[PDB]
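Our platform keeps sequence and structure together, in a single record for each protein. Because each token names a local backbone shape, the row as a whole describes the fold. One such record is reproduced below, unchanged from the form in which we store it:
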Amino acid sequence: QCRRLCYKQRCVTYCRGR
């Protein structure tokens, strides 16, 4: 359960958890 978001010309994988 991860999403793909790009901010300030930077993309990173964010996963909901601990």
About this structure: Residues 1 and 17 are 9 Å apart (CA to CA). DSSP finds no helices and two strands in the chain. Strands lie at 2-7, 10-15.
